[PDB]
Every structure is written in structure tokens, then in C-alpha cells.
């Protein structure tokens, strides 16, 4: 399948080179997989989710996304027009308030929730969790991330937007998950993207168009936008049977575009998410 005039990020994921406009992907599109977007929530009513999105847990008075962030990330995972895995099942877990903030205890709780909740969802092709959030180093947050991964979930987390080594940020610094950096349209490391040895992969993160609340759309930047590309790619690949939740991150790294990014510091992988789709 081919999506013409797709967001640059989608087109980059199905290309060996930057600057293309079509997103090529297998028609299965992540059917049968499930992705938990652990964020500010998901506007499930947005037409772009076509009924494939549902809120399953909130740690606040309401399950509504009063911010937009969570909706945008969910959109990049699986909305019709802006998503990597267009047929995946989206589950919203609101651990961030409407200002985009959340206590670590709450974020930890959300991760444990997903580890248990998946045991009662129908996801024959696998489960993925996308965490476009982060803060200072925390052994407890990292352990929660590691537990979620160990439980059988493909965890993708943002590297952080501090233009620094991700070793000082959580859950970015947890080795066993998939830590994602951001890149721009010209294959440059996003100016704000964290780097370092703990990074596993890069995804499109600068000027990323996706869904927003109020049934709208908008472009924003962050490692937060790169993360759901990798989460969506994992789901896509798991549905195709190419990999599993436990191995998806290294499978994506194995098959990434190599050596294409600029301003990558010594000690950081030069690998960019790639679906290797051959019509």
C-alpha cells in the first residue's frame, strides 16, 4: 500500500533517503496488535481513529485529553492519515494531567496497569506501549519501565528534549526498553533531542503533523513525536510476524537506516527507524 503526500515522517520510515512524500507500507497495517499510549489521554471520538481508539484508564477526574499531547502521539501511532500502523488498536492511559505533567508515582502506576490490563484484551499480534514523557533519573521509574517490558510489552520511550545525555533521564535511561531520539526532515539530529549510549534508535520528531483535540490537527516537535513512530513500527512489524515484543527493538535497530543522520555525538547510534517495505 502507498499513502501519497504523507507526513514527511511517515515517508521517511519507508525510505532509504530523506525528501520523499509517499508512505509505503504493507496493507496489514498493524491489525491485531495493540498499542497503549501512556500520556495525557486520547480523544477517541476523533474521526481519524475510525473507532480504533479507546480510553481504558485515567488517574484524574476525567479520561478526556484536555491537552492534546496524548491525542497527537496516538495519532502518529495509528490514525488513518498520520499513523504508522493504521489498523492497530489504541488504548489510552492518562497518567499526565491536562498541563502535560504527572507525578512519578502515577506514571509508575500506569505502567503497572498496562502490564496487567493487557492480559484481558484481544491482541493476537502483540502489545506495544508508547511513553512520550520523562523527567530526571529515577530508579523506580526505570524499574517500572523494565517490568512493563519483562511482562511481554514492547516499550518505546522518549529520549528527552534536553540536548544532553539521556542517562540522566527516566524512563529514557532504562536499558531494557526502546529509547528513541528525534530527527528532522533533513536527517539532522533534532536540536533538542537527547543522545548517548542508552539510545537504541532515532525516529522523526521535528515538525510532525498529527491529530489534536477538538477533532483538529497540528504539527509539533519532540522526542515525544519520534517515540510513537517506533511504537507504531513495532506494532506494524509484529503484525507481519517479523519480530516479537521482546525482540522488536533490536529488530528495528538491526534493520534501521545506518549512518544517515548528522550531528550524532560519538557514542550514540546512528540508526533511523525503517520498515524495509518492498512492494
Amino acid at each position: 500500500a502507498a499513502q501519497t503526500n504523507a507526513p514527511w515522517g511517515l515517508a521517511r520510515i519507508s525510505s532509504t533517503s530523506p525528501g520523499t512524500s509517499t508512505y509505503y507500507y504493507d496493507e496489514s497495517a498493524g491489525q491485531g496488535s495493540c498499542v497503549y499510549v501512556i500520556d495525557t489521554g486520547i480523544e477517541a471520538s476523533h474521526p481519524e481513529f475510525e473507532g480504533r481508539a479507546q480510553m481504558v484508564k485515567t488517574y484524574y477526574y476525567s479520561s478526556r485529553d484536555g491537552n492534546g499531547h496524548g491525542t497527537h502521539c496516538a495519532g502518529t501511532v495509528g490514525s488513518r492519515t498520520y499513523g504508522v500502523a493504521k489498523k492497530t488498536q489504541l488504548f489510552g492511559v492518562k497518567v499526565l494531567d491536562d498541563n502535560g505533567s504527572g507525578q512519578y508515582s502515577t506514571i509508575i502506576a500506569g505502567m503497572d496497569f498496562v502490564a496487567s490490563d493487557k492480559n484481558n484484551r484481544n491482541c493476537p499480534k502483540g502489545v506495544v506501549a508508547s511513553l512520550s514523557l520523562g523527567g530526571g533519573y529515577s530508579s523506580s521509574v526505570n524499574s517500572a519501565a523494565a517490568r512493563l517490558q519483562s511482562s511481554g510489552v514492547m516499550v518505546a520511550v522518549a529520549a528527552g528534549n534536553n540536548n544532553a545525555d539521556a542517562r540522566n533521564y527516566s524512563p529514557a535511561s532504562e536499558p531494557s526498553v526502546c529509547t528513541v531520539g528525534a530527527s528532522d526532515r533533513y536527517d539532522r539530529r533534532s536540536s533538542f533531542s537527547n543522545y548517548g549510549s542508552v539510545l537504541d534508535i532515532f525516529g522523526p520528531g521535528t515538525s510532525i503533523l498529527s491529530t489534536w483535540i477538538g477533532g483538529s490537527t497540528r504539527s509539533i516537535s519532540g522526542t515525544s513525536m519520534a517515540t510513537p513512530h517506533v511504537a507504531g513500527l513495532a506494532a506494524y512489524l509484529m503484525t507481519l510476524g517479523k519480530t516479537t515484543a521482546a525482540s522488536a527493538c533490536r529488530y528495528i535497530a538491526d534493520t534501521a537506516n545506518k549512518g544517515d543522520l548528522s550531528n550524532i555525538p560519538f557514542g550514540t547510534v546512528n540508526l533511523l527507524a525503517y520498515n524495509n517495505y518492498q512492494a
Binding site: D39, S105, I108, A109, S132, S138, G222, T223
Partner: peptide, 10 residues
């Protein structure tokens, strides 16, 4: 716009 938030670590 990007990321989220921190502290406490349960």
C-alpha cells in the same frame, strides 16, 4: 508540545 513530567518515584 513535547514530553511530560517528573518526580516522586512512588
Amino acid at each position: 508540545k513535547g514530553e511530560a513530567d517528573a518526580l516522586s518515584l512512588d
